[PDB]
Design a protein around this ligand. Structure first.
Ligand code: CLA
Ligand code: CLA
Ligand code: CLA
Ligand code: CLA
Ligand code: CLA
Ligand code: CLA
Ligand code: CLA
Ligand SMILES: CCCCCCCCCCCCCCCC(=O)OC[C@H](COP(=O)(O)OC[C@@H](O)CO)OC(=O)CCCCCCCCCCCCCCC
Ligand SMILES: CC1=C(/C=C/C(C)=C/C=C/C(C)=C/C=C/C=C(C)/C=C/C=C(C)/C=C/C2=C(C)CCCC2(C)C)C(C)(C)CCC1
Ligand SMILES: CC1=C(/C=C/C(C)=C/C=C/C(C)=C/C=C/C=C(C)/C=C/C=C(C)/C=C/C2=C(C)CCCC2(C)C)C(C)(C)CCC1
Ligand SMILES: CC1=C(C/C=C(\C)CCC[C@H](C)CCC[C@H](C)CCCC(C)C)C(=O)c2ccccc2C1=O
Ligand code: SF4
Lengths: 160, 164, 91, 192, 732, 63
C-alpha cells in the first residue's frame, strides 16, 4: 500500500532500532552497572525494544526513511491508525461537547446564569458528565426531535 | 500605559543587544581554553573585532554560527532548548497576532462564532467578547517579551552549555 | 478522404436542422431572451450607437425567417462538425 | 401506495396513472417541475421498453450482447453487422448524422405540443390500432408505467452488469446466475 | 484648489496628510468630487491604456537590456554553462572587488545575472540574435506608443465612448473570447508553427523569408482537404538537439505529450497544437452572446432563467446582470479572482511541465518564477476579495439584489464565517499539533514515534496519472483501464516517460512532510479566506457596528466605545489577510524551494526525513541553505552573492521597520511631532524656516498601510534574496 | 399604547444588539409624539454594557 514496506520486514526500521540502542549503550559506558542513572538508561533500552516490537506487530507501514507511516484512507488493514482511535476520540470529544452544551441549558434557566459559569455548579456538572456517556443517542435524538438546533427567527443575526 | 507598552519593546531591543554584545564579546575575547606554553584559544577566535561591526556578521558569526547548537541539539539532552527555541518563535509570532490586529475585527469574528453557538444552543450567558485594546496590547507585548526572551534563553543555554 | 462530399453533406445536415428542425427552437429563444438589456433598457436604447441591431443585413426573404446570419451560424456548425468528421476519418 | 399506511403527499393524490406516492426526497414538490417529470418518466420508459427487446433478442439469437455489438464504431473497421449481415451504409459518420437528423426531427416535433396531456399520450397517428379509443383507458396507462418502470429498472440492471462484469451481457449474466445461483449474485459486486 | 485636485475635502487639509492621501486616493476615481459616470469609465479606459503602455515599455527595456548588455547569443550557443545576463551594472559605489566579482557570463564588466527566465522564453519562441531582440524592443516601443496615442485619443471629446458602450458586456465578451483569446492564440500558433518550430529545427525563418519558408512539406493542402494527421506525421525524435536540424521532424502539430528529452521541456509542436485548440475553442466560444445580429445570448435572461424552482437559491441569479454591469468593483473582483486562480495555475504548471527550453535545468530561475507567480497571485486574490468588500459597501444595492444568491450570501454570512473559522481552527490545531509532536519525537531521540501520514489521496491521484511508484494500479498505471487504452497510443507514451522519471518535477514523490505542509497550505488558504470572506460579508455592517457601509470602505475605527472598535473595517480585514497571504505563500514557497533544493542535488531523503518537523525546516532549510547567503560578504572578502546578502539584511530592516508602524500607534507619534514642532518653532536660525504642511503623525489607515507595505517589501526581499542566493550559489 | 408592561417581546430592529432576542418590557410611554416609547430590559448587556433600550411598537412583536 502506497509503496511502503511493512515495518516488520523493513531494513530501515531495523536500522533505527540498532542505532537507538547503540546510542543508549554508549551512554551506559560511563556509568557503574549497578548505579541509579544506569537503571534509567536500562529502562530506556527496554522501553525502546518494547516500542519497536509493538510497531512491527501492528502491521505498520514503513517508508524508505525507516519510519512508520499512517494510512488514513480507511483501509481494512489500517483501522487502528486513524479510524479506530478517531472513533475513540470523537466519542470523547463529543462527550466534552455534550456535557458543556447540556450544562449551558441547565444554567440558562437559573436565577443568575452568569455566576454559574465562573463558579461551575459541580453537583449540576457531575450529574450530566455521567450523562455524556450516551451522547450519539442523545445528539441525534435531539437532532431528530428538533431540540438540537435553534430556528433562525430566535437567533441574533447581524444586519446586512 | 501605551508608552510603557512601547518601552517594553525598547527594553527588549536594548537588553537583547546588551546580552548579545556580552555573549559575543566574551565568547570571542574572554571565554576559551589555555593549552601549554600560554596560548589562549577562544570559542569564536578574534571575530568580534571584525564581524561585530556589520549586521551581516551579527546575523552570520553570532546568530547563525552560534545557533549551530540549538537546532542540532535534537536527540540529545539539550533538545528541550531546541523545543523551547522553536516554541519561543511560536510565542513571538503569536504576539504579532495581538500586536498588529485590533479589537473590532475579533469582536465581529466572535459574533459569527456566537451565531454558530446560538444555532446549536450552546450560547454562554457570559457573553464572549474580544480582548480590550489595552488588553490586546498587553497580551501582545507579554507574548513578544516571553517569546523573544525565551528564544534568547534557549539559544544562549544551548550554545554556551554545548561549547562550555 | 472525399472532402467535397463530407463538408457539403455535413453543412447541409446542420442547415437542414437550422431551417426545418431547430428554427422554432431558435426563433422562440431569440424572442424570450430578446436583445441584451442593461438596467432595464437596450444597449442601443441607453446610447450606444455601435450596439444597434442591423436590419438591412437581417432583411431575409425566407418565409420562415431564416436569415444570412443563421446561414453563417448553422453553416459554421456544419463545417465544425464537417471538419470534426474529416479529421476523425483521416487518422 | 408504495408503503401501506404511509401518508401520501398533497401533490400526489392518486388520480395520475401509477401515482403510488413514491417521492421521499420531494423532487416533484414544485408544480411546474412535476409536469415535466410526468412526460420525462414516460419517454424514458418508452425508450427503455424499446431497449429490453433490443438487448435480449439480439443476445438470444446469437449476435452478441449490446456492448460487443456497439464496439465496432470505435474500431476503424467494424462494417456494422446487422442480423449477421454488414449493411453498406453502416459507417460511424453516416449513422450518427442520420440519428442527429431523424431523431432530432422526431424530438422537436414531440416538444411542439402545447397541451400537457397530448405531450404524454398523443394518440391519432401514434395509435393506429384504436386501443386509446376503446372501453379501457385508465388501466392501460397504469399498464404503461408498470411495464415502463420494470424496463427502466431492467436497463439500470443492464448497464451496471456491464460495469461490474465487462465483456459479458445480460443474458450471459442470466446464464451465469442460472447455473449456481447461490454463489454468483450482487454480493460478488458488493464484496470483492 | 490645491493638490489633490480630485478631492476638495483633502485640499483644505493644512497638514502633511493632504500630501499623503492624495497619493493614495489618486486612482480611487469613484470617490472623487464632482465626479460622474462618463468621466469614471473614460479615465479608467485611459488608465488601462497607460497600464498597457507601461507593460510594453517594461518588456521593451527587458528586451533592450538583453540585446544590449546581455549575452543572448552566447547563451544560445551553450544554454547549460552560461549564466543569462540581465543588464550591466554602473554603480559608482563599487570598489575593485565588486567590479571583479560581479563580472559573470563572460562579460566586459559587472553585470546582473537574469533570473527571470526571459532567455529560455525568447530562445524557445524563436529569438536567436541580439538584433531580433532589438527589433522586438523597437516594435514594442511602437506598440506602447500606439497605446499612448489611443489612450490620449479616447479622452478627446470626438472619440469619447459612452457608458452604454462600456457596459456592453455581450459585445465585450464576444470580442474578447473571439479576438483577445482566439485570434491571439491562433496568431501565436502561426508564430509557433512558422518561426519557433523551424528555429528549433535549425531553419532561420524571419520576416524576409516568411512567405517562402514553408512550415510543412505539404503546407495548407492537407489542412483544407481534411487530412490533418499529415501535420502529425513525422514528429521530432528523441535524438533531436534543440536548435539544430539533425534528429528533427517535419510535423508542426503533434500530440506527443511529455517532455523534449534534451531540454526536459514541452514540445513546440505540442504547444502549437495546444494553441490551435485553445484558439478554435475560443473563437467558437466567442460566438455565444448577442450583439448586433439577432442570434446569441442575453446574459440578463440567462441569469434570470437560472433559478432553481425549489427555492433553495431564493431568486437564483435574478438581478445579478445589472449588479455586475453597474459595479466596476464586482467585475474587477471577478477578474482578480480568476487572475489569481490562473496566476497560480501558471506557477503550478511551469515547474512541473516546463514550457521553455533549458528552463528546467536552470534551478534558481525556476524558483524565482514560481515564487513570482505565487506572490503576485496571493496579492491578486486578496485584491479580488478586497474588491468584493468594496462592492458590498459602495456598489451593492439590497433592493436590486432581492433574495438572489448574492443577497443570500449576506443572509447566511455568519454560517460561512463560522465554518471557515472551524476549518481554519481544525487545520491549525492538527497541523501545529502534528508538527510539534514530530518535533518532540525528534527532540526525545525517537524519530519512529512521529505521526507520519502518507498522503494516499494525492498519491492515488498520482497513480491515477500514471505513477507506478506507489503501486495503486487503478487507471493509467494499470493496463486494464479504458482510459489507459484510449490514451496509450495517443499521448501516454510521452506522459508516462515524463511522469515515471524521478529527476524532473512532474508530479513528485510525496510523503508525510508533503501531507503536513499541504495542511499548512490548506490552513493558509482557509484562514486567508476566513479573514477575507469576513471582511467582504461584514462590509456593510455587523452586530458591533451596523452602519459600516456609511463610513466608507477604509475607515480607521469607530472609537473606544462599545468595548473597542479597532480594525473593524473591511480594509482592515484585507490588511490582516495580507499577513496571511504572506504566511501562506511563504509556506508554499518554502515547501517548493526545499522540495526542489533537495531534489536538484539528489538527496530527497533529507526532505523526506526533515520536513515532517519544524526543526528540520529551521535547520536543514532556513539555516543550511543560508550558508553561502550571509557569507556573500565577509571581513575577508565579498562574493558574487553579496548583493543578495545585503538584500537579505535589507529585508530584515524593512520588515522590522513595518513593526514600528504595526505595533506603535498614532498618538505617541502625534505628541512626539508636537514636541518636534515646538523645537523647530523655538530653535534660533531654524525658526526662520517654516512648513506649509503642518507636521502630523501618520493617520491610522495610513499607518496600517505603511506597516503592511514595509512588511511586504521586507518579506519579498528577504525571500527573493535567500531564494536567489541559496540556489544560485549552490547550483543544485 | 405598547403591547403590555411586563411582557416578553422580540426585537425586529436590525441595528440593535438584541435583534431576534427575548426582552422584557418595563415601561411604555403613553405621551403622544414619542417615537420609541416601549422600554425593553434584556438579560444580556450589549458592548456598551447597558441593557435598557427604547423601541417603537412597530419594531417589536409578542413572543
Ligand atoms: C461548552 C462546549 C462547547 C461546545 C459544544 C462547542 C462547540 C462548537 N464550537 Mg466552541 N468553544 C467553547 C466551547 C464549546 N464549543 C469554548 C469554551 C470556547 C473558547 C475556547 C469556544 C470557542 C470557539 C471557537 C473559536 C470556534 C468554536 C466553534 C465551535 C463549533 C465546532 C467545534 C470547534 O470548532 O472546535 C472547538 C473549538 C475550540 C476553540 C475548542 C474549545 C472547546 C473547549 C475546550 C470546551 C470547553 C467545555 C467545558 C465545559 C468548559 C461548535 C458549534 C467554531 C464555530 O464558529 O462554529 C463552527 C469556532 O470558530 N468554538
Ligand atoms: C487590476 C488590479 C487592480 C485595480 C486597478 C484596483 C483598483 C483600485 N483599488 Mg485595488 N487591489 C488590488 C487590485 C487592483 N486594484 C490588489 C492587487 C490589491 C492587493 C494589494 C488591492 C487592494 C486595495 C485596497 C484594499 C484598496 C484598493 C483600492 C483601489 C483603488 C485605488 C486606490 C489607490 O489609488 O491606491 C494607491 C495606492 C498606493 C499609492 C500605495 C502603493 C504603495 C506600494 C504598495 C508600495 C481602485 C478602485 C482602494 C479603494 O477602492 O478604496 C475604497 C482600497 O481601499 N485596492
Ligand atoms: C476583437 C476585438 C477586440 C480585441 C482584440 C480587444 C482587446 C482588448 N480590449 Mg477590448 N473591446 C472590444 C474589442 C476588442 N477588445 C469590444 C467590441 C468592446 C466593446 C464593448 C471592448 C471594450 C473593452 C473595454 C471597455 C476594455 C477593453 C480592453 C481591452 C484590452 C484587454 C486588457 C489587455 O490588454 O489584457 C490583455 C489580455 C490578454 C492578451 C488575454 C490573456 C488571457 C490570460 C490572462 C493570459 C493567458 C495568456 C498566456 C498564458 C500568457 C503567456 C504570455 C507570457 C509568455 C508572457 C485588450 C487590448 C480594456 C483595456 O485595457 O483598455 C485599453 C478596457 O478597458 N476593451
Ligand atoms: C492568424 C494566424 C496566422 C497567420 C497570419 C498565418 C499566415 C500565413 N500562413 Mg499560416 N499557420 C497558422 C496560422 C497563421 N498563419 C496555423 C494555424 C497553422 C497551423 C495549421 C499554420 C500553418 C501554415 C502552413 C503549413 C502554411 C501557412 C502559410 C501561410 C502564409 C499564406 C497563407 C495563405 O496562402 O492563405 C502566411 C504567411 C502557407 C505558406 O505559404 O507559408 C510560407 C503554408 O502553406 N500556414
Ligand atoms: C490525539 C490527539 C488529539 C488532540 C489533542 C486534538 C485536539 C483537538 N481536536 Mg482533534 N482529532 C484527533 C485527535 C486529536 N485532536 C483525531 C484522531 C481526530 C480524527 C477523528 C481529530 C479530528 C477532530 C475533529 C473532527 C475536531 C477535533 C477538534 C479538536 C479540538 C477541540 C475539541 C474539543 O474541545 O471539543 C469541542 C467540542 C466539540 C463538540 C467538537 C468535537 C467534534 C465533534 C465530536 C464532531 C482540540 C484542540 C476540533 C478541531 O480541531 O476543529 C476546530 C474538531 O472539530 N479534532
Ligand atoms: C505562530 C503564530 C500564529 C498563530 C498560531 C496564530 C493563531 C491563529 N490565527 Mg493567526 N495571525 C498571526 C500569527 C499566528 N496566528 C499574525 C502574525 C497575524 C497577523 C496580524 C495573525 C492574525 C490572525 C487573524 C487576522 C486571524 C487569525 C486566526 C488565527 C487562528 C487560526 C485558526 C487556527 O489555526 O487555529 C489553531 C490554533 C492554533 C494553531 C494556536 C495554538 C495554540 C495552542 C492551543 C496553545 C496551547 C489561530 C488562533 C483567525 C481566527 O482566529 O479565526 C479562527 C483569524 O481570523 N490570525
Ligand atoms: C477540513 C479539513 C481538511 C482540509 C482542508 C484538508 C486539505 C487537504 N488534504 Mg486532507 N484530510 C483531512 C482534513 C482535511 N484535508 C483529514 C481529517 C484527514 C485524515 C488525517 C485527511 C487526509 C488526507 C490525505 C491522506 C491527503 C489529504 C490531502 C489533502 C488535499 C486534498 C483534499 C483532500 O483529500 O481532503 C480530504 C478530506 C477529508 C477526508 C476530510 C474532510 C474534512 C473532515 C470533515 C474532517 C488538501 C490540501 C492530500 C495531500 O496532503 O496532498 C499531498 C492527501 O493525499 N488529506
Ligand atoms: C440518490 C438520488 C439523489 C438526488 C438528490 C438530490 C435532491 O435532493 O435535489 C435537491 C436539489 C434540487 O433542488 P432544485 O430546487 O434544483 O430542484 C427542485 C427539485 O424539487 C427538483 O424538481 O438538488 C441538489 O441540491 C443538487 C444535488 C446534486 C448536486 C450535484 C452537484 C454537481 C456538481 C457539479 C458537477
Ligand atoms: C435550398 C434553397 C435555396 C438554396 C440555399 C443554399 C444553396 C444554401 C447554401 C448554404 C451554404 C453554402 C452555407 C455555407 C455556410 C458556410 C459557413 C458559414 C462556413 C463557415 C466555416 C467555419 C466558421 C469553419 C470554421 C473552422 C475553421 C475556419 C478552421 C478551424 C476549424 C473550423 C472547422 C471550426 C434557396 C435560397 C435558393 C431557396 C430555395 C431553397
Ligand atoms: C466576496 C465577493 C466577491 C469575490 C469572491 C471571491 C474572490 C471568490 C473566490 C472564489 C474562487 C477564487 C474560487 C475558485 C474556484 C475554482 C474552482 C471551484 C475550481 C474547480 C475545478 C474543477 C471542479 C475542475 C474539474 C476537474 C478537476 C478537479 C480534475 C480533473 C479535470 C477537471 C477539469 C475535470 C465578488 C468579487 C464576486 C463580489 C461579490 C462579493
Ligand atoms: C486573537 C485576538 C483576540 C481574541 C482573543 C480571545 C478571544 C482570547 C481567547 C482566550 C481563550 C483561548 C478563550 C477562553 C478559554 C476558557 C478558559 C475556556 C477553556 C477552553 C480551553 C482553553 C481549555 C482579541 O480579542 C484581540 C483584541 C485586540 C487585538 C488583538 C486581538 C487578537 O489577536
Ligand atoms: S484610535 Fe486607535 S486605539 Fe482608538 S479606537 Fe481607533 S484604532 Fe482603537
Amino acid at each position: 500500500v502506497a509503496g511502503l514496506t511493512p515495518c516488520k520486514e523493513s531494513k530501515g526500521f531495523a536500522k533505527r532500532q540498532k542505532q537507538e540502542i547503540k546510542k543508549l549503550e554508549g551512554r551506559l559506558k560511563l556509568y557503574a552497572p549497578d548505579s541509579a542513572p544506569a537503571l534509567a538508561i536500562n529502562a530506556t533500552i527496554e522501553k525502546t525494544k518494547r516500542r519497536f516490537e509493538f510497531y512491527g506487530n501492528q502491521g505498520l507501514l514503513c517508508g524508505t526513511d525507516g519510519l512508520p507511516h499512517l494510512i488514513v484512507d480507511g483501509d481494512q488493514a489500517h483501522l487502528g491508525e486513524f479510524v479506530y482511535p478517531g472513533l475513540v476520540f470523537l466519542y470523547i470529544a463529543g462527550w466534552i461537547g455534550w456535557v458543556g452544551r447540556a450544562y449551558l441549558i441547565d444554567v440558562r434557566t437559573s436565577k443568575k446564569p452568569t455566576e454559574k459559569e465562573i463558579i461551575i455548579d459541580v453537583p449540576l456538572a457531575l450529574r450530566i458528565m455521567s450523562k455524556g456517556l450516551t451522547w450519539p443517542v442523545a445528539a441525534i435524538g435531539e437532532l431528530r426531535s428538533g431540540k438540537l438546533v435553534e430556528k433562525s427567527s430566535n437567533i441574533t443575526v447581524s444586519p446586512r | 500605559w501605551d508608552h510603557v507598552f512601547l518601552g517594553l519593546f525598547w527594553m527588549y531591543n536594548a537588553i537583547s543587544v546588551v546580552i548579545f554584545h556580552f555573549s559575543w564579546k566574551m565568547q570571542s575575547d574572554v571565554w576559551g581554553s589555555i593549552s601549554d606554553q600560554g596560548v589562549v584559544t577562544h570559542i569564536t577566535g578574534g571575530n568580534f573585532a571584525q564581524s561585530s561591526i556589520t549586521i551581516n556578521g551579527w546575523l552570520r558569526d553570532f546568530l547563525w554560527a552560534q545557533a549551530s547548537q540549538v537546532i542540532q541539539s535534537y536527540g540529545s539532552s539539550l533538545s528541550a532548548y531546541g523545543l523551547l527555541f522553536l516554541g519561543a518563535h511560536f510565542v513571538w509570532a503569536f504576539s504579532l497576532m495581538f500586536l498588529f490586529s485590533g479589537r473590532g475585527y475579533w469582536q465581529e469574528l466572535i459574533e459569527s462564532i456566537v451565531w454558530a453557538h446560538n444555532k446549536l444552543k450552546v450560547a454562554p450567558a457570559i457573553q464572549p467578547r474580544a480582548l480590550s485594546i489595552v488588553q490586546g496590547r498587553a497580551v501582545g507585548v507579554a507574548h513578544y517579551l516571553l517569546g523573544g526572551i525565551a528564544t534568547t534563553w534557549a539559544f544562549f543555554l544551548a550554545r554556551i552549555i554545548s561549547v562550555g | 478522404a472525399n472532402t467535397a462530399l463530407t463538408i457539403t453533406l455535413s453543412t447541409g445536415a446542420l442547415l437542414f436542422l437550422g431551417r426545418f428542425v431547430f428554427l422554432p427552437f431558435q426563433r422562440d429563444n431569440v424572442s424570450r431572451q430578446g436583445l441584451p438589456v442593461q438596467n432595464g433598457v437596450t444597449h442601443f436604447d441607453a446610447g450606444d450607437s455601435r450596439a444597434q441591431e442591423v436590419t438591412s443585413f437581417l432583411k431575409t426573404n425566407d418565409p420562415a425567417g431564416f436569415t444570412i446570419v443563421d446561414v453563417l451560424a448553422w453553416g459554421a456548425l456544419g463545417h465544425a462538425v464537417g471538419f470534426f468528421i474529416l479529421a476523425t476519418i483521416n487518422n | 401506495e408504495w408503503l401501506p399506511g404511509n401518508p401520501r403527499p398533497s401533490y400526489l393524490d392518486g388520480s395520475a396513472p401509477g401515482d403510488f406516492g413514491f417521492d421521499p426526497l420531494g423532487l416533484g414538490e414544485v408544480p411546474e417541475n412535476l409536469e415535466r417529470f410526468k412526460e420525462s418518466e414516460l419517454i424514458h420508459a418508452r425508450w427503455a421498453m424499446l431497449a429490453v427487446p433490443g438487448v435480449l433478442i439480439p443476445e438470444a439469437l446469437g449476435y452478441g450482447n449490446w456492448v460487443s455489438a456497439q464496439k465496432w464504431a470505435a474500431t476503424p473497421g467494424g462494417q456494422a453487422t446487422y442480423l449477421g449481415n454488414p449493411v453498406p451504409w453502416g459507417n460511424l459518420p453516416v449513422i450518427l448524422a442520420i440519428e442527429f437528423l431523424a431523431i432530432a426531427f422526431a424530438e422537436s416535433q414531440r416538444n411542439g405540443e402545447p397541451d400537457p396531456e397530448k405531450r404524454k399520450y398523443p394518440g391519432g397517428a401514434f395509435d393506429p390500432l384504436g386501443f386509446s379509443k376503446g372501453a379501457n383507458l385508465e388501466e392501460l396507462k397504469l399498464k404503461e408505467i408498470k411495464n415502463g418502470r420494470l424496463a427502466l429498472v431492467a436497463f439500470l440492471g443492464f448497464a451496471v452488469q456491464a460495469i461490474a462484469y465487462p465483456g459479458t451481457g445480460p443474458l450471459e449474466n442470466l446464464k451465469t446466475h442460472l447455473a449456481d445461483p447461490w454463489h454468483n449474485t450482487i454480493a460478488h459486486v458488493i464484496i470483492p | 484648489s490645491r493638490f489633490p485636485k480630485f478631492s476638495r475635502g483633502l485640499s483644505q487639509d493644512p497638514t502633511t496628510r493632504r500630501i499623503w492621501f492624495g497619493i493614495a486616493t489618486a486612482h480611487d476615481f469613484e470617490s472623487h468630487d464632482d465626479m460622474t459616470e462618463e468621466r469614471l469609465y473614460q479615465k479608467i479606459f485611459a488608465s488601462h491604456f497607460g497600464q498597457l503602455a507601461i507593460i510594453f515599455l517594461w518588456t521593451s527595456g527587458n528586451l533592450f537590456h538583453v540585446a544590449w548588455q546581455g549575452n543572448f547569443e552566447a547563451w544560445g550557443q551553450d544554454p547549460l554553462h552560461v549564466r543569462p545576463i540581465a543588464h550591466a551594472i554602473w554603480d559608482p559605489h563599487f570598489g575593485q572587488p565588486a567590479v571583479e566579482a560581479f563580472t559573470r557570463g563572460g562579460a566586459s564588466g559587472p553585470v546582473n545575472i537574469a533570473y527571470s527566465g526571459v532567455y529560455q522564453w525568447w530562445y524557445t519562441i524563436g529569438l536567436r540574435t541580439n538584433q531580433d531582440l532589438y527589433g522586438g524592443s523597437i516594435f514594442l516601443l511602437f506598440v506602447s506608443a500606439l497605446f499612448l496615442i489611443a489612450g490620449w485619443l479616447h479622452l478627446q471629446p470626438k472619440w469619447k465612448p459612452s457608458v452604454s458602450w462600456f457596459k456592453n458586456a455581450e459585445s465585450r465578451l464576444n470580442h474578447h473570447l473571439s479576438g483577445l483569446f482566439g485570434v491571439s492564440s491562433l496568431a501565436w500558433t502561426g508564430h509557433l508553427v512558422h518561426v519557433a518550430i523551424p528555429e528549433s529545427r535549425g531553419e532561420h525563418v524571419r520576416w524576409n523569408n516568411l512567405l517562402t519558408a514553408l512550415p510543412h512539406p505539404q503546407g495548407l493542402g492537407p489542412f483544407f482537404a481534411g487530412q490533418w494527421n499529415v501535420y502529425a506525421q513525422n514528429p521530432d525524435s528523441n535524438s533531436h538537439l534543440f536548435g539544430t536540424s539533425e534528429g528533427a521532424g517535419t510535423a508542426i502539430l503533434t500530440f506527443l505529450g511529455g517532455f523534449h528529452p534534451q531540454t526536459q521541456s514541452l514540445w513546440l509542436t505540442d504547444m502549437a497544437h495546444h494553441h490551435l485548440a485553445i484558439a478554435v475553442i475560443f473563437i467558437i466560444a466567442g460566438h455565444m452572446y448577442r450583439t448586433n445580429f439577432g442570434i446569441g445570448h442575453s446574459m440578463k435572461e440567462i441569469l434570470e432563467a437560472h433559478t432553481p424552482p425549489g427555492g433553495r437559491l431564493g431568486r437564483g441569479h435574478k438581478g445579478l446582470y445589472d449588479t455586475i454591469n453597474n459595479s466596476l468593483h464586482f467585475q474587477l473582483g471577478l477578474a482578480l479572482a480568476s487572475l489569481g486562480v490562473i496566476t497560480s495555475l501558471v506557477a503550478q504548471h511551469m515547474y512541473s511541465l516546463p514550457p521553455y527550453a533549458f528552463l528546467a535545468q536552470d534551478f534558481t530561475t525556476q524558483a524565482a518564477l514560481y515564487t513570482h507567480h505565487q506572490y503576485i497571485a496571493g496579492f491578486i486574490m486578496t485584491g479580488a476579495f478586497a474588491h468584493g468588500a468594496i462592492f458590498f459597501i459602495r456598489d451593492y444595492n439590497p433592493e436590486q439584489n432581492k433574495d438572489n444568491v448574492l443577497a443570500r450570501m449576506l443572509e447566511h454570512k455568519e454560517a460561512i464565517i463560522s465554518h471557515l473559522s472551524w476549518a481554519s481552527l481544525f487545520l491549525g490545531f492538527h497541523t501545529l499539533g502534528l508538527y510539534v509532536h514530530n518535533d518532540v519525537m525528534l527532540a526525545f531521540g525517537t524519530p519512529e514515534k512521529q505521526i507520519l501520514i502518507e498522503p494516499v489521496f494525492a498519491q492515488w491521484i498520482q497513480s491515477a496519472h500514471g505513477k507506478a511508484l506507489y503501486g495503486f494500479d487503478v487507471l493509467l498505471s494499470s493496463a486494464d483501464s479504458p482510459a489507459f487504452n484510449a490514451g496509450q497510443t495517443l499521448w501516454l507514451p510521452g506522459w508516462l516517460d515524463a511522469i515515471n522519471n524521478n529527476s524532473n518535477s512532474l508530479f513528485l514523490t510525496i510523503g508525510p512532510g508533503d501531507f503536513l505542509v499541504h495542511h499548512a497550505i490548506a490552513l493558509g488558504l482557509h484562514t486567508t479566506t476566513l479573514i477575507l470572506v469576513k471582511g467582504a460579508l461584514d462590509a456593510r455592517g455587523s452586530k458591533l457596528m451596523p452602519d459600516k457601509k456609511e463610513f466608507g470602505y477604509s475607515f480607521p475605527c469607530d472609537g473606544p466605545g462599545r468595548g473597542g472598535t479597532c480594525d473593524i473595517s473591511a480594509w482592515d480585514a484585507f490588511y490582516l489577510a495580507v499577513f496571511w497571504m504572506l504566511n501562506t505563500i511563504g509556506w508554499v514557497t518554502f515547501y517548493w524551494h526545499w522540495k526542489h533544493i533537495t531534489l536538484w542535488q539528489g538527496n530527497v531523503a533529507q526532505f523526506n526525513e526533515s520536513s515532517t518537523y519544524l526543526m528540520g525546516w529551521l535547520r536543514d532549510y532556513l539555516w543550511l541553505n543560508s550558508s553561502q547567503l550571509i557569507n556573500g560578504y565577509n571581513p575577508f572578502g565579498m562574493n558574487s552573492l553579496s548583493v543578495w546578502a545585503w538584500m537579505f539584511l535589507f529585508g530584515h530592516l524593512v520588515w522590522a521597520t513595518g513593526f514600528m508602524f504595526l505595533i506603535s500607534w498614532r498618538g505617541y507619534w502625534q505628541e512626539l511631532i508636537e514636541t518636534l514642532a515646538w523645537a523647530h518653532e523655538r530653535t534660533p536660525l531654524a525658526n526662520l524656516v517654516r512648513w506649509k504642511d503642518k507636521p502630523v503623525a501618520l493617520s491610522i489607515v495610513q499607518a496600517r498601510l505603511v506597516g503592511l507595505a514595509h512588511f511586504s517589501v521586507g518579506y519579498i526581499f528577504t525571500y527573493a534574496a535567500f531564494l536567489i542566493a541559496s540556489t544560485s550559489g549552490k547550483f543544485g | 399604547i405598547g403591547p403590555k408592561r411586563g411582557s416578553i417581546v422580540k426585537v425586529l430592529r436590525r441595528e440593535s444588539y438584541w435583534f431576534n432576542d427575548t426582552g422584557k418590557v418595563v415601561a411604555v410611554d403613553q405621551a403622544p409624539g414619542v417615537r420609541y416609547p416601549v422600554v425593553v430590559r434584556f438579560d444580556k448587556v450589549n458592548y456598551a454594557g447597558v441593557s435598557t433600550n427604547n423601541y417603537s411598537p412597530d419594531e417589536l412583536e409578542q413572543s
